[PDB]
Amino acid sequence: MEHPSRLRSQHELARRYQQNGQVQEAVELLEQVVAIQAKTLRSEHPSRLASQHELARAYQANGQVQEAVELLEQVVAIQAKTLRSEHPSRLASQHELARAYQANGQVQEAVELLEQVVAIQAKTLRSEHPSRLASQHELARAYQANGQVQEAVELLEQVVAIQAKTLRSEHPSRLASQHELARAYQANGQRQEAQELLEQVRAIQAKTQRS
Amino acid sequence: MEHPSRLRSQHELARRYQQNGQVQEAVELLEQVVAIQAKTLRSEHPSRLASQHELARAYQANGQVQEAVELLEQVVAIQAKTLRSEHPSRLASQHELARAYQANGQVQEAVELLEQVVAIQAKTLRSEHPSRLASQHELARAYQANGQVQEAVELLEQVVAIQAKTLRSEHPSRLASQHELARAYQANGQRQEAQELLEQVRAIQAKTQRS
């Protein structure tokens, strides 16, 4: 095949399949992509690594979590040698491996990867960037699943404090982080605080949305 | 709020939530986005329509199919007045409404929308474009669910014939369309043809992938 890197186009076809429930078909598509690129591209080639990342995502969507973990461990190991910590593709595969680890009950390993992603994004992205916020919320949930509920509260209290100085009370992201904090408070046995915060969020949502 | 169009950033946060199973949280985020933009932006404003499209996708992911259908019907009706048929956003919401209709058992309506999307993409996109191919495969499946199995076979036979002249036998898209055609043959009672074609696909996949 002329230019096997151009099989990047197949990532979108796979995504379309997954959205309609055709998760098996997506895995079969990307297995063929990965096999073609394995014959033609070096193991450190970013196009080859990108397709392995996409195949691992497809594996997880098809319930093949162990397969996803093993493939992402390979991608992350190769990128740990070839890419800086701040490289967006390195961060993307660390994040995806943390997702797969979580699905596989490997909660400690997921926390370690998400701490890395959150620490690096604290440098490279602004506080209201949705990718940065999403990773903070994901880390908080991973903390809770690893018995580190106090650390989830500490993290989310800091996020919420910053948003109180930067975003309007009605901003969807400010409300989202307050909801996540209320969840963390509940897991931490701070149930009165959780109830109070949830009431505040619901009141703002009602004012904004209720016709 | 200063520039409510910039709440487009929240679409990515919602997508991150959905990927981790937090589909309720995604709906709540986008309900707030849509409410804020409803107070500030005209009904035909593309940013407002984009958030309604994203909310409808979130509704479907959260099992709220009727809500998704009703909201997309509104978006599609407004865009039928404001956008050309070839506008990519018009096509995107027609496609998404067809998805919601399918989930809601409204198979005829889904077929009509997908025929429109496929007819327009036959002009605007090349034959191997993954979005064009995905819509062709989706239309074929909608045909089958609407008792139009012969039309699915006709469509996919034409796709496969074109690919035989443009793509290598090992190309993931060529194999994907042959698999879809075999499925259509089976639904059409052409079970020997389906078996034959499936065997061909599996043989090529084995040759490419088997170590």
- Alpha carbon distance B197, B118 (integer Å): 25
- Alpha carbon distance A202, B136 (integer Å): 43
* Dihedral Cα B6, B7, B8, B14, nearest 10 deg: 160
Q: Which residues of A touch B175 (CB under 8 A)?
A: 28-29, 32
Q: Which residues of A touch B172 (CB under 8 A)?
A: 7, 10, 13, 29-30, 32-33, 36
Fold of B1-211: 1.25.40
* Dihedral Cα B158, B161, B165, B171, nearest 10 deg: 100
Contact between A12 and B130 (Cβ < 8 Å): yes
List the single residue in B13, B131, B209 with the smallest CB-CB distance to A12: B131
Collect all residues with Cβ–Cβ distance below 8 Å to B29 and sequence separation of at least 6: A172, A173, A175, A176, B10, B13, B14, B17, B58
- Alpha carbon distance A188, A185 (integer Å): 5
Q: Which residue matches tokens 């078996």? A: B195
| Dihedral angle sign, alpha carbons of residues A65, A67, A72, A77 | positive
- Alpha carbon distance B97, B103 (integer Å): 10
- CA B167 to chain CA mean position, Å: 23
Q: Which residues of A touch B24 (CB under 8 A)?
A: none
- Check CB contact under 8 Å for B16 and A134: yes
CA–CA distance from B27 to each of A176, B59, B89 (Å)? 11, 6, 21
Which residue numbers of B have CB closer than 8 Å to A's CBs? 1, 7, 9-13, 16-17, 19-20, 25, 28-33, 35-36, 99, 128-131, 133-134, 137-138, 141, 168, 170-173, 175-176, 179, 205, 208-209
What experiment produced this structure? X-ray
| Dihedral angle sign, alpha carbons of residues B105, B111, B112, B118 | positive
Please give the residue of chain A at the shortest CA–CA distance from B33. A172
Residue to substitute from B13, B30, B180, interface A, most A β-carbons within 10 A: B13
Contact between A180 and A156 (Cβ < 8 Å): yes
Contact between B18 and B59 (Cβ < 8 Å): no
User: How many Cβ pairs closer than 8 A exist between chain A and B?
Assistant: 110
Q: Angle at CA A117, nearest 5°, toward A111 and A118? A: 85
Q: Which residue pairs, CB below 8 angstroms and at least 24 apart, start in A135-142? A: A135/A95, A136/A177, A137/A176, A137/A177, A137/A180, A137/B17, A138/A95, A138/A98, A138/A114, A138/B16, A138/B20, A139/A111, A139/A114, A139/A115, A140/A180, A140/A184, A141/A180, A141/B20, A142/A98, A142/A102, A142/A107, A142/A110, A142/A111, A142/A114
List the single residue in B12, B25, B36 with the smallest CB-CB distance to A208: B36
According to DSSP, residue A41 is labeled: S
Domain ranges within chain B, ordered by starting residue: 1-211
Give chain A's length: 211
- Check CB contact under 8 Å for B99 and A19: yes
Collect all residues with Cβ–Cβ distance below 8 Å to A195 and sequence separation of at least 6: A182
Which residue numbers of A have CB closer than 8 Å to B's CBs? 1, 7, 9-13, 16-17, 19-20, 25, 28-33, 35-36, 99, 128-131, 133-134, 137-138, 141, 168, 170-173, 175-176, 179, 205, 208-209
Q: Which residues of B touch A168 (CB under 8 A)?
A: 1
- Alpha carbon distance B95, A105 (integer Å): 37
- Check CB contact under 8 Å for A9 and B128: yes
Q: What is the DSSP string of B92-148?
A: HHHHHHHHHHHHTT-HHHHHHHHHHHHHHHHHHS-TT-HHHHHHHHHHHHHHHHTT-
Which two three-digit tokens encode residue B114? 């997908």
Return the closest-CA partner of residue A110 out of A81, A148, A78, A84: A148
Resolution number, Å: 1.6
Q: How far apart are the first and last CA of chain B?
A: 58
How close does chain B come to A82, measured CA to CA in Å? 26
- Alpha carbon distance A135, B60 (integer Å): 24
Collect all residues with Cβ–Cβ distance below 8 Å to A12 and sequence separation of at least 6: B130, B131, B134
- Check CB contact under 8 Å for B13 and A173: yes
- Check CB contact under 8 Å for B133 and A13: yes
Q: Which residue matches tokens 């369309």? A: B177
List the single residue in B17, B33, B209 with the smallest CB-CB distance to A35: B209
